[PDB]
Tab-separated table of N, CA, C and O and ligand atoms in Angstrom:
chain	number	residue	atom	x	y	z
A	1	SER	N	0.910	-0.841	0.543
A	1	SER	CA	-0.559	-0.452	0.099
A	1	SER	C	0.808	1.471	-0.366
A	1	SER	O	2.383	1.161	-0.165
A	2	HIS	N	0.443	2.642	-0.209
A	2	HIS	CA	0.633	3.263	0.105
A	2	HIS	C	0.230	4.389	1.478
A	2	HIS	O	-1.321	4.372	1.216
A	3	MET	N	1.761	5.551	1.712
A	3	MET	CA	0.539	6.715	2.990
A	3	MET	C	0.751	8.378	2.146
A	3	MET	O	2.018	7.874	1.741
A	4	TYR	N	0.127	8.902	2.451
A	4	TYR	CA	0.388	10.413	2.105
A	4	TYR	C	0.113	11.448	3.221
A	4	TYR	O	0.406	11.484	4.185
A	5	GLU	N	0.919	12.449	2.525
A	5	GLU	CA	0.656	13.989	3.064
A	5	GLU	C	0.892	14.493	2.843
A	5	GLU	O	1.384	15.052	1.897
A	6	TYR	N	0.104	15.591	3.036
A	6	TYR	CA	-0.317	16.904	3.592
A	6	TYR	C	-0.366	17.856	3.958
A	6	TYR	O	0.155	18.551	4.808
A	7	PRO	N	0.375	19.057	2.942
A	7	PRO	CA	0.664	20.436	3.791
A	7	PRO	C	-0.657	20.804	5.344
A	7	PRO	O	-2.008	20.061	4.851
A	8	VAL	N	-0.139	21.423	5.970
A	8	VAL	CA	-0.773	22.141	6.967
A	8	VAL	C	-1.188	24.110	6.446
A	8	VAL	O	-0.210	24.476	7.085
A	9	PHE	N	-2.038	23.966	6.324
A	9	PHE	CA	-2.607	25.437	6.222
A	9	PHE	C	-2.962	26.560	7.448
A	9	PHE	O	-3.780	25.601	8.538
A	10	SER	N	-2.511	27.211	7.971
A	10	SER	CA	-2.984	28.395	9.262
A	10	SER	C	-3.539	29.339	8.315
A	10	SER	O	-3.742	29.657	7.229
A	11	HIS	N	-4.524	29.624	9.977
A	11	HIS	CA	-5.723	30.008	9.533
A	11	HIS	C	-5.790	30.926	11.535
A	11	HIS	O	-6.184	30.441	11.878
A	12	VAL	N	-6.396	32.087	10.783
A	12	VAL	CA	-6.691	32.601	12.123
A	12	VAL	C	-8.014	33.343	11.751
A	12	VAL	O	-8.854	33.504	11.697
A	13	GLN	N	-8.810	33.693	13.273
A	13	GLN	CA	-9.869	33.895	14.065
A	13	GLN	C	-10.411	36.081	12.940
A	13	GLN	O	-9.600	36.550	12.897
A	14	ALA	N	-11.193	36.088	12.239
A	14	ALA	CA	-12.194	37.031	11.799
A	14	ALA	C	-11.844	37.895	12.657
A	14	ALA	O	-11.353	38.928	12.712
A	15	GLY	N	-13.226	37.787	11.867
A	15	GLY	CA	-14.047	38.851	13.525
A	15	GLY	C	-13.231	39.042	14.581
A	15	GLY	O	-12.685	37.937	14.918
A	16	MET	N	-13.140	40.249	16.116
A	16	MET	CA	-13.182	40.022	16.740
A	16	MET	C	-14.052	38.636	17.883
A	16	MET	O	-14.288	37.908	18.749
A	17	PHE	N	-15.105	38.664	17.333
A	17	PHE	CA	-15.929	37.790	18.291
A	17	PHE	C	-16.462	36.384	16.877
A	17	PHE	O	-17.737	36.035	17.808
A	18	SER	N	-16.163	36.357	15.942
A	18	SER	CA	-16.262	35.363	15.341
A	18	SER	C	-14.966	33.892	15.113
A	18	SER	O	-14.320	33.570	14.343
A	19	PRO	N	-14.801	33.709	16.435
A	19	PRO	CA	-14.397	32.150	16.777
A	19	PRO	C	-14.585	31.618	15.578
A	19	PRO	O	-13.345	30.435	15.316
A	20	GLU	N	-15.631	30.604	14.892
A	20	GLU	CA	-15.956	30.304	14.180
A	20	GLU	C	-15.645	30.441	12.664
A	20	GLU	O	-15.405	30.008	11.579
A	21	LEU	N	-15.552	32.156	12.661
A	21	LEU	CA	-15.272	32.456	11.067
A	21	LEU	C	-13.555	32.733	11.443
A	21	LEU	O	-13.321	32.825	12.266
A	22	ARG	N	-13.058	31.890	10.296
A	22	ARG	CA	-11.591	31.690	10.518
A	22	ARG	C	-11.181	32.381	9.080
A	22	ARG	O	-12.202	32.571	7.684
A	23	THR	N	-9.733	32.370	9.065
A	23	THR	CA	-9.697	33.298	7.193
A	23	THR	C	-7.880	33.003	7.301
A	23	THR	O	-7.383	32.961	8.021
A	24	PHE	N	-7.581	32.704	5.920
A	24	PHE	CA	-6.749	31.925	6.211
A	24	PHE	C	-5.610	32.799	6.158
A	24	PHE	O	-5.252	34.295	5.854
A	25	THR	N	-4.095	32.700	6.939
A	25	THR	CA	-2.836	33.713	7.204
A	25	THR	C	-1.658	33.987	5.009
A	25	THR	O	-1.708	32.258	5.222
A	26	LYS	N	-1.127	34.759	5.591
A	26	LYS	CA	0.069	35.073	4.353
A	26	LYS	C	0.577	33.541	4.674
A	26	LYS	O	1.498	33.865	6.483
A	27	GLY	N	1.542	33.236	3.443
A	27	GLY	CA	2.555	32.594	3.847
A	27	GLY	C	2.031	30.819	3.900
A	27	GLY	O	1.857	30.441	4.441
A	28	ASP	N	3.446	30.413	2.906
A	28	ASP	CA	3.397	29.118	2.619
A	28	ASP	C	3.323	28.208	4.570
A	28	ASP	O	3.470	28.820	4.873
A	29	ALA	N	2.581	26.969	3.327
A	29	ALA	CA	3.106	26.176	5.118
A	29	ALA	C	4.472	25.241	5.458
A	29	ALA	O	5.036	25.809	4.909
A	30	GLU	N	4.090	25.135	6.708
A	30	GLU	CA	5.832	24.476	7.105
A	30	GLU	C	5.458	23.708	7.763
A	30	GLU	O	6.559	22.778	9.002
A	31	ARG	N	4.378	23.663	7.868
A	31	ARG	CA	4.571	21.788	8.857
A	31	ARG	C	3.171	20.736	7.727
A	31	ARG	O	2.390	20.973	6.838
A	32	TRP	N	3.272	19.737	7.410
A	32	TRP	CA	3.210	18.474	6.364
A	32	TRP	C	2.192	16.992	6.823
A	32	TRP	O	3.238	16.352	7.799
A	33	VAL	N	1.636	17.207	7.418
A	33	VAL	CA	1.067	15.615	7.735
A	33	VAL	C	0.974	14.753	7.005
A	33	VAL	O	-0.190	14.653	6.522
A	34	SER	N	1.427	13.395	7.487
A	34	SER	CA	0.786	12.222	7.237
A	34	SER	C	-1.009	11.650	7.177
A	34	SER	O	-1.377	12.078	8.254
A	35	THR	N	-0.882	10.451	7.106
A	35	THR	CA	-2.243	9.702	6.604
A	35	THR	C	-2.754	8.884	5.487
A	35	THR	O	-1.719	8.893	4.904
A	36	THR	N	-2.950	8.189	5.725
A	36	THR	CA	-3.369	6.652	5.594
A	36	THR	C	-4.056	6.816	4.499
A	36	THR	O	-4.702	6.648	2.605
A	37	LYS	N	-5.012	8.069	4.481
A	37	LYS	CA	-5.916	8.764	3.775
A	37	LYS	C	-5.441	9.076	2.147
A	37	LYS	O	-4.503	10.052	2.407
A	38	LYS	N	-5.938	8.720	1.122
A	38	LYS	CA	-5.815	9.260	-0.389
A	38	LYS	C	-6.756	10.184	-0.671
A	38	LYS	O	-7.763	10.202	-1.065
A	39	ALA	N	-6.325	10.849	-1.154
A	39	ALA	CA	-7.199	12.480	-0.679
A	39	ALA	C	-5.983	13.207	-2.988
A	39	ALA	O	-5.759	13.372	-2.823
A	40	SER	N	-7.376	14.301	-3.240
A	40	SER	CA	-6.937	14.947	-4.539
A	40	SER	C	-5.537	15.867	-4.086
A	40	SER	O	-5.099	16.012	-3.267
A	41	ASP	N	-4.817	16.468	-5.215
A	41	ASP	CA	-4.009	16.767	-4.740
A	41	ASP	C	-3.769	18.967	-4.533
A	41	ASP	O	-3.027	19.376	-4.420
A	42	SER	N	-5.277	18.545	-4.056
A	42	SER	CA	-5.301	20.581	-3.472
A	42	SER	C	-5.710	20.242	-1.723
A	42	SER	O	-5.870	21.026	-1.648
A	43	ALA	N	-5.784	18.494	-1.962
A	43	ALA	CA	-5.864	18.044	-0.754
A	43	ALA	C	-5.558	18.574	0.303
A	43	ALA	O	-3.969	19.561	0.216
A	44	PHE	N	-5.416	19.391	1.782
A	44	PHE	CA	-4.672	20.431	3.038
A	44	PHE	C	-5.151	20.089	4.917
A	44	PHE	O	-6.283	19.761	4.473
A	45	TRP	N	-4.781	20.477	5.507
A	45	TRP	CA	-5.394	19.981	6.239
A	45	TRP	C	-5.070	21.456	7.833
A	45	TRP	O	-5.450	22.720	6.982
A	46	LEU	N	-5.859	21.968	8.952
A	46	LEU	CA	-6.963	22.880	9.564
A	46	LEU	C	-6.054	22.693	10.831
A	46	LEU	O	-6.286	20.454	11.086
A	47	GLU	N	-6.362	23.215	11.272
A	47	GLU	CA	-5.922	22.835	12.752
A	47	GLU	C	-6.971	23.577	13.621
A	47	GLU	O	-7.571	25.198	13.460
A	48	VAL	N	-7.590	22.749	14.260
A	48	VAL	CA	-9.060	22.987	15.409
A	48	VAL	C	-8.828	24.196	16.047
A	48	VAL	O	-8.115	23.155	17.192
A	49	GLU	N	-8.869	25.763	15.946
A	49	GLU	CA	-8.565	26.243	17.130
A	49	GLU	C	-9.361	26.339	17.840
A	49	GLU	O	-9.514	27.318	19.173
A	50	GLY	N	-10.880	25.566	17.877
A	50	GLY	CA	-11.883	26.315	18.822
A	50	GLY	C	-12.945	24.991	19.099
A	50	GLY	O	-11.856	24.669	19.343
A	51	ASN	N	-13.868	25.399	20.065
A	51	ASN	CA	-14.546	24.407	21.147
A	51	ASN	C	-16.462	24.490	19.808
A	51	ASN	O	-17.005	23.571	20.719
A	52	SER	N	-15.964	25.117	19.493
A	52	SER	CA	-17.357	25.154	18.275
A	52	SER	C	-17.762	23.400	17.517
A	52	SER	O	-18.641	23.089	17.559
A	53	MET	N	-17.211	22.933	17.643
A	53	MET	CA	-17.080	21.957	16.804
A	53	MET	C	-17.278	20.196	18.232
A	53	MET	O	-16.493	19.401	17.772
A	54	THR	N	-16.483	21.111	19.617
A	54	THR	CA	-16.511	20.660	20.342
A	54	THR	C	-17.597	19.824	21.178
A	54	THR	O	-18.670	20.411	21.635
A	55	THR	N	-18.099	18.306	21.166
A	55	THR	CA	-19.637	17.589	21.761
A	55	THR	C	-19.259	17.171	22.464
A	55	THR	O	-18.498	16.438	23.108
A	56	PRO	N	-20.392	16.949	23.898
A	56	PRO	CA	-20.402	16.805	25.020
A	56	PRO	C	-19.930	14.882	25.104
A	56	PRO	O	-19.361	14.556	26.248
A	57	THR	N	-18.273	11.837	17.600
A	57	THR	CA	-17.771	12.197	16.823
A	57	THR	C	-17.348	13.870	17.540
A	57	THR	O	-18.394	13.945	17.770
A	58	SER	N	-16.104	13.773	17.297
A	58	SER	CA	-15.996	15.416	17.807
A	58	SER	C	-14.797	16.332	17.589
A	58	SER	O	-13.590	15.239	17.159
A	59	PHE	N	-14.444	17.668	16.867
A	59	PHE	CA	-12.623	17.822	16.476
A	59	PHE	C	-12.685	19.195	17.900
A	59	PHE	O	-12.964	20.590	17.200
A	60	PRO	N	-11.946	19.030	18.728
A	60	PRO	CA	-11.449	19.737	19.646
A	60	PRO	C	-10.445	20.587	19.183
A	60	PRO	O	-9.831	20.398	17.641
A	61	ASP	N	-9.818	21.773	19.901
A	61	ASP	CA	-8.584	22.877	19.605
A	61	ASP	C	-7.716	22.195	19.576
A	61	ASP	O	-6.742	21.556	21.167
A	62	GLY	N	-7.055	21.349	18.717
A	62	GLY	CA	-6.096	21.117	18.650
A	62	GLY	C	-5.521	20.204	18.161
A	62	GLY	O	-4.911	19.173	17.220
A	63	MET	N	-6.840	19.415	17.654
A	63	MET	CA	-6.955	18.498	16.026
A	63	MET	C	-7.173	18.865	14.885
A	63	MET	O	-7.412	20.070	14.237
A	64	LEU	N	-6.639	17.635	14.186
A	64	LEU	CA	-6.360	17.973	12.569
A	64	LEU	C	-7.674	17.724	11.722
A	64	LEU	O	-7.460	16.490	11.778
A	65	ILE	N	-8.127	18.227	10.810
A	65	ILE	CA	-8.937	17.623	9.779
A	65	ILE	C	-7.925	18.102	8.369
A	65	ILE	O	-8.093	19.381	8.403
A	66	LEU	N	-8.995	16.839	7.297
A	66	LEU	CA	-8.051	17.019	6.509
A	66	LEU	C	-9.287	17.045	5.469
A	66	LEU	O	-9.960	16.826	5.574
A	67	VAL	N	-8.974	18.157	4.634
A	67	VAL	CA	-9.973	19.098	3.640
A	67	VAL	C	-9.499	18.872	2.351
A	67	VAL	O	-8.394	19.190	1.983
A	68	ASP	N	-10.395	18.225	1.481
A	68	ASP	CA	-10.488	18.115	-0.105
A	68	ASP	C	-11.257	18.842	-0.603
A	68	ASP	O	-12.310	18.261	-0.934
A	69	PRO	N	-10.677	19.843	-0.932
A	69	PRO	CA	-11.838	21.020	-1.949
A	69	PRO	C	-12.626	19.809	-3.471
A	69	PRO	O	-13.145	20.374	-4.379
A	70	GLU	N	-11.930	18.548	-3.944
A	70	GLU	CA	-12.192	17.794	-4.673
A	70	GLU	C	-13.535	17.065	-5.049
A	70	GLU	O	-13.184	16.384	-5.693
A	71	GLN	N	-13.977	17.209	-3.539
A	71	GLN	CA	-15.067	16.279	-3.213
A	71	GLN	C	-15.913	16.696	-3.185
A	71	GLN	O	-16.347	17.558	-2.577
A	72	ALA	N	-17.463	16.003	-3.532
A	72	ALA	CA	-18.784	17.425	-3.647
A	72	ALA	C	-19.366	16.622	-2.375
A	72	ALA	O	-18.733	15.232	-1.860
A	73	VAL	N	-19.269	16.978	-1.780
A	73	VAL	CA	-20.502	17.530	-0.044
A	73	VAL	C	-21.740	17.606	-0.721
A	73	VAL	O	-22.086	17.674	-1.216
A	74	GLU	N	-22.098	16.320	0.836
A	74	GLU	CA	-23.719	16.527	0.957
A	74	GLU	C	-24.240	16.310	1.974
A	74	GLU	O	-23.452	16.545	2.813
A	75	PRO	N	-25.349	16.598	2.724
A	75	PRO	CA	-25.800	16.796	4.211
A	75	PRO	C	-25.007	15.365	4.894
A	75	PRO	O	-25.877	14.573	3.997
A	76	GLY	N	-24.995	15.558	6.490
A	76	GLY	CA	-24.490	14.101	7.141
A	76	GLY	C	-23.342	14.419	6.048
A	76	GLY	O	-22.290	14.021	7.567
A	77	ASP	N	-22.246	15.244	5.459
A	77	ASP	CA	-20.480	15.253	5.702
A	77	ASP	C	-20.264	16.374	6.293
A	77	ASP	O	-21.161	17.282	6.866
A	78	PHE	N	-19.468	17.262	6.724
A	78	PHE	CA	-18.434	17.507	7.630
A	78	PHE	C	-17.980	18.102	6.373
A	78	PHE	O	-17.694	17.309	5.361
A	79	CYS	N	-17.709	20.083	6.027
A	79	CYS	CA	-16.953	20.431	5.733
A	79	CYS	C	-16.312	21.667	5.522
A	79	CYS	O	-16.892	22.240	7.182
A	80	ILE	N	-15.743	22.456	4.666
A	80	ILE	CA	-15.776	23.981	5.264
A	80	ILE	C	-16.319	24.810	4.230
A	80	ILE	O	-16.511	24.624	2.978
A	81	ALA	N	-17.025	25.966	4.761
A	81	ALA	CA	-17.796	26.818	3.873
A	81	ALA	C	-16.866	27.599	3.610
A	81	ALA	O	-17.337	28.233	5.067
A	82	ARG	N	-17.406	28.707	2.824
A	82	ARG	CA	-16.545	29.315	2.966
A	82	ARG	C	-18.325	31.329	2.813
A	82	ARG	O	-19.288	30.577	2.335
A	83	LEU	N	-17.657	31.956	3.550
A	83	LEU	CA	-18.765	32.909	3.533
A	83	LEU	C	-18.670	33.976	3.735
A	83	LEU	O	-16.743	34.780	4.185
A	84	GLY	N	-19.310	34.740	2.928
A	84	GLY	CA	-19.324	36.827	3.077
A	84	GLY	C	-17.818	37.143	1.774
A	84	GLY	O	-18.030	38.172	1.224
A	85	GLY	N	-17.111	35.682	1.394
A	85	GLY	CA	-16.103	36.095	-0.566
A	85	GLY	C	-15.099	35.939	0.545
A	85	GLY	O	-14.286	35.234	-0.409
A	86	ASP	N	-14.883	35.871	1.955
A	86	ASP	CA	-13.253	36.082	2.240
A	86	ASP	C	-13.208	34.962	3.224
A	86	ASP	O	-11.905	34.194	3.110
A	87	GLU	N	-14.764	35.130	4.398
A	87	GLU	CA	-14.066	34.149	5.695
A	87	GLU	C	-14.588	32.815	5.461
A	87	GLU	O	-15.011	32.281	4.396
A	88	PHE	N	-14.570	31.609	6.580
A	88	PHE	CA	-14.701	30.711	5.377
A	88	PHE	C	-14.889	29.475	7.474
A	88	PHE	O	-14.256	30.183	9.117
A	89	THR	N	-15.707	28.341	7.476
A	89	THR	CA	-15.904	28.483	9.136
A	89	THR	C	-16.480	26.124	8.728
A	89	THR	O	-16.454	25.608	7.488
A	90	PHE	N	-15.523	25.558	9.736
A	90	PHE	CA	-15.084	24.169	9.616
A	90	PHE	C	-17.269	23.678	9.995
A	90	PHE	O	-17.296	24.053	11.896
A	91	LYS	N	-17.609	23.479	9.824
A	91	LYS	CA	-19.133	23.015	10.070
A	91	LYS	C	-19.102	21.388	9.432
A	91	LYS	O	-19.562	20.726	9.019
A	92	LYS	N	-21.092	20.980	10.330
A	92	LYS	CA	-21.433	19.471	9.494
A	92	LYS	C	-22.605	20.315	8.913
A	92	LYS	O	-22.990	20.727	9.001
A	93	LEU	N	-22.776	19.655	7.055
A	93	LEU	CA	-23.322	20.059	6.763
A	93	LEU	C	-24.837	18.726	6.790
A	93	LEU	O	-24.710	17.936	7.051
A	94	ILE	N	-26.167	20.040	7.180
A	94	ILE	CA	-27.006	18.649	7.421
A	94	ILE	C	-27.831	19.694	6.140
A	94	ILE	O	-28.321	20.491	6.169
A	95	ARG	N	-29.404	18.794	6.481
A	95	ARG	CA	-31.194	19.292	6.131
A	95	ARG	C	-31.923	19.554	7.359
A	95	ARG	O	-32.372	18.316	8.315
A	96	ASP	N	-31.985	20.473	8.175
A	96	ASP	CA	-32.797	20.728	9.288
A	96	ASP	C	-34.157	21.098	8.533
A	96	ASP	O	-34.275	22.013	7.756
A	97	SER	N	-34.900	20.279	8.573
A	97	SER	CA	-36.257	20.050	8.072
A	97	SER	C	-36.930	20.481	6.160
A	97	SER	O	-37.506	21.013	6.224
A	98	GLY	N	-35.226	20.170	6.135
A	98	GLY	CA	-35.811	20.680	4.238
A	98	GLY	C	-34.253	21.151	3.681
A	98	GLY	O	-34.154	22.149	2.578
A	99	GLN	N	-34.538	21.781	4.974
A	99	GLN	CA	-33.381	23.524	4.656
A	99	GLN	C	-31.830	23.348	4.854
A	99	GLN	O	-32.083	22.175	5.593
A	100	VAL	N	-30.850	23.314	3.738
A	100	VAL	CA	-29.337	23.443	3.973
A	100	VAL	C	-28.879	23.850	5.385
A	100	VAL	O	-29.315	25.759	5.114
A	101	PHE	N	-28.132	23.800	6.754
A	101	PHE	CA	-27.449	24.666	7.415
A	101	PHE	C	-26.011	23.709	7.827
A	101	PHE	O	-25.954	22.900	7.371
A	102	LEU	N	-25.294	24.935	8.900
A	102	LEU	CA	-24.156	24.398	9.158
A	102	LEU	C	-24.265	24.242	10.036
A	102	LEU	O	-24.707	25.248	10.757
A	103	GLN	N	-24.029	23.092	10.469
A	103	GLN	CA	-24.061	22.916	12.155
A	103	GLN	C	-23.162	22.661	12.822
A	103	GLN	O	-22.100	22.120	12.112
A	104	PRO	N	-22.614	23.418	13.680
A	104	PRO	CA	-21.509	23.033	14.624
A	104	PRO	C	-22.320	21.973	16.168
A	104	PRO	O	-23.033	21.752	15.813
A	105	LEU	N	-20.864	20.638	16.317
A	105	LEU	CA	-20.559	20.282	17.676
A	105	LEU	C	-21.333	20.568	18.577
A	105	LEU	O	-21.589	19.974	19.215
A	106	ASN	N	-21.319	21.775	18.615
A	106	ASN	CA	-21.136	21.587	20.427
A	106	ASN	C	-22.777	23.693	20.335
A	106	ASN	O	-22.300	24.106	19.598
A	107	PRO	N	-23.851	22.730	21.002
A	107	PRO	CA	-24.839	23.867	20.845
A	107	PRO	C	-24.952	24.911	21.289
A	107	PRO	O	-25.958	25.487	21.341
A	108	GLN	N	-23.455	24.893	21.409
A	108	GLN	CA	-23.952	26.908	22.507
A	108	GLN	C	-23.203	27.888	20.738
A	108	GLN	O	-23.059	29.325	20.900
A	109	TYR	N	-23.201	26.786	19.988
A	109	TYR	CA	-23.112	28.284	18.957
A	109	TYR	C	-23.933	27.380	17.508
A	109	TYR	O	-24.584	26.808	17.515
A	110	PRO	N	-24.471	29.227	16.921
A	110	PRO	CA	-26.361	29.150	16.575
A	110	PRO	C	-25.459	28.057	15.114
A	110	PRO	O	-24.533	28.056	14.517
A	111	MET	N	-26.474	27.336	14.541
A	111	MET	CA	-26.780	27.402	12.606
A	111	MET	C	-26.621	28.087	11.870
A	111	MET	O	-27.638	29.098	12.487
A	112	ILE	N	-26.053	28.517	10.920
A	112	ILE	CA	-25.454	29.249	9.825
A	112	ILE	C	-26.292	28.139	8.249
A	112	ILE	O	-26.385	27.225	7.975
A	113	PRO	N	-27.141	28.790	7.560
A	113	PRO	CA	-27.829	29.173	6.407
A	113	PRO	C	-26.610	28.750	5.176
A	113	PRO	O	-25.623	29.979	5.834
A	114	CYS	N	-27.191	27.867	4.310
A	114	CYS	CA	-25.898	28.343	3.616
A	114	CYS	C	-26.986	28.151	2.222
A	114	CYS	O	-26.853	27.034	1.766
A	115	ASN	N	-26.965	29.124	1.683
A	115	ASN	CA	-27.581	29.553	0.001
A	115	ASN	C	-27.119	30.733	0.044
A	115	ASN	O	-26.722	30.432	-1.655
A	116	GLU	N	-27.227	32.261	-0.219
A	116	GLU	CA	-26.420	33.176	-1.407
A	116	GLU	C	-24.809	33.183	-0.362
A	116	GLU	O	-23.311	33.122	-1.619
A	117	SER	N	-24.348	33.967	0.474
A	117	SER	CA	-23.468	33.567	0.590
A	117	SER	C	-22.438	33.050	1.852
A	117	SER	O	-21.593	33.347	2.003
A	118	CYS	N	-23.176	32.275	0.807
A	118	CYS	CA	-22.322	30.162	1.367
A	118	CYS	C	-22.523	29.594	0.631
A	118	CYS	O	-23.169	29.268	-0.486
A	119	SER	N	-20.955	28.789	0.240
A	119	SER	CA	-20.305	27.825	-0.931
A	119	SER	C	-19.529	27.114	-0.081
A	119	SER	O	-18.904	27.404	0.692
A	120	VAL	N	-19.605	25.840	-0.580
A	120	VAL	CA	-18.455	24.792	0.241
A	120	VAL	C	-17.800	24.694	-0.733
A	120	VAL	O	-17.159	24.373	-1.964
A	121	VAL	N	-16.152	24.310	0.567
A	121	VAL	CA	-15.281	24.618	-0.051
A	121	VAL	C	-13.866	23.401	-0.192
A	121	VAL	O	-13.747	22.741	-0.667
A	122	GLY	N	-14.731	22.440	0.763
A	122	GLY	CA	-14.649	21.200	0.764
A	122	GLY	C	-14.584	20.051	1.839
A	122	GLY	O	-15.513	20.565	2.334
A	123	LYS	N	-14.541	18.563	1.462
A	123	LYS	CA	-15.177	17.906	2.152
A	123	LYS	C	-13.996	17.794	3.052
A	123	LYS	O	-12.555	17.722	3.316
A	124	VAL	N	-14.227	17.355	4.429
A	124	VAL	CA	-13.600	16.635	5.909
A	124	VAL	C	-13.283	15.483	5.513
A	124	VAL	O	-14.245	14.648	5.163
A	125	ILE	N	-12.331	14.704	5.404
A	125	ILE	CA	-12.462	13.950	4.878
A	125	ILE	C	-11.746	12.542	6.060
A	125	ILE	O	-11.090	11.247	6.185
A	126	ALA	N	-10.604	13.300	6.655
A	126	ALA	CA	-10.308	12.587	8.142
A	126	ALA	C	-9.912	13.802	8.817
A	126	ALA	O	-9.971	14.507	8.712
A	127	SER	N	-9.094	13.431	10.019
A	127	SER	CA	-8.803	13.769	10.839
A	127	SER	C	-7.248	13.340	11.428
A	127	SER	O	-7.425	11.956	11.930
A	128	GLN	N	-7.028	14.235	12.584
A	128	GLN	CA	-5.638	13.745	13.430
A	128	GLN	C	-6.204	13.908	15.625
A	128	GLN	O	-6.641	13.058	15.967
B	1	CA	CA1	-6.812	17.956	-9.162
B	2	CA	CA1	-5.768	26.940	19.899
B	3	CA	CA1	-20.544	11.405	-0.241
B	4	CA	CA1	-8.414	10.536	12.805
């Protein structure tokens, strides 16, 4: 068999009170994390730096999530969604009564619609 290793990209809190909102930092990556998971060449890792995805499946501050911008995302999958055109968020894509929403694993965070100022950047396919 064969193993893979993808770049880990940096990102920081967008707004001042928007821990869920994140923005990619400037600069190349200096960290490459391996995995058994094979993905597209645009695949990369992100470091969970908050607790909005921390449940009572869970992604605590310090966990790495592998993002693949080349795989189709559907309700039930976790993904990185882009909002406002610049910032992005890590949520679970779901269907609440037929409506498409981004859901945080931590109930202390609000759910967001994904319609106009919302597009899907990639599927989460693995974690460390
Ligand atoms: Ca490609
Ligand atoms: Ca942190
Ligand atoms: Ca699928
Ligand atoms: Ca894992």
